[PDB]
Amino acid sequence: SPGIWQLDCTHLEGKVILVAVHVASGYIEAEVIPAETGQETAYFLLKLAGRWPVKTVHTDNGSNFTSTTVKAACWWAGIKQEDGGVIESMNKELKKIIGQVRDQAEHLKTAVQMAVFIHNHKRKGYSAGERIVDIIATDI
């Protein structure tokens, strides 16, 4: 459970938001990209694995599961690349937060990082940021 993450992809303003969800805590990392490609997904996973102890990733679709570039990043970072409700509600929640801050940000990427901040600090009482740290520290 502590090393399991789920990839998720959603569209907004003609752009793609790639999200990594830490399944046990609900903690997220997200980035805005022009379109989902194997190279963008591979780079996102390399970043995530250098920051958190990523053991397994459930890919968001069969193209990212199949991608030789994604498989190479998973090999490099020591990640077990795996296949495939609450994710749909999290995409809706993220878009809701983005809408609420959209006026404070000129760039979509700024609004997305503001939403990541709000989601991870929301007490619902522990926050997702507190839960991920507690889950991983117990495993050490």
Residues contributing to the site for ligand KZD (CB under 6 A): 39, 42-43, 46, 68-69, 71-73, 75-76, 105-107, 110
- State CA 129 to chain mean position distance: 13
**Residue placing its CB nearer to ligand KZD in the complex, 104 or 138:** 104
Amino acid at 33: I
- Residue 23 interaction partner, one of ligand KZD, a copy of itself, none, beta carbon < 5-8 Å per kind: none
Report the 10 Å Cβ neighbour count for 99: 12
Smallest distance, Å, CB 75 to ligand KZD? 4
- State CA 89 to chain mean position distance: 14
**Cα torsion through 66, 72, 78, 83, rounded to 10:** -10
Residue 52 CB-half CA count within 13 A: 24
**Residue placing its CB nearer to a copy of itself in the complex, 13 or 84:** 13
Q: Where do contacts with a copy of itself occur on this chain (CB under 8 A)?
A: 29, 43, 46-47, 49-53, 76-77, 104, 109-110, 113-114, 116-117, 120-121, 129-130, 133-134, 136-138, 140
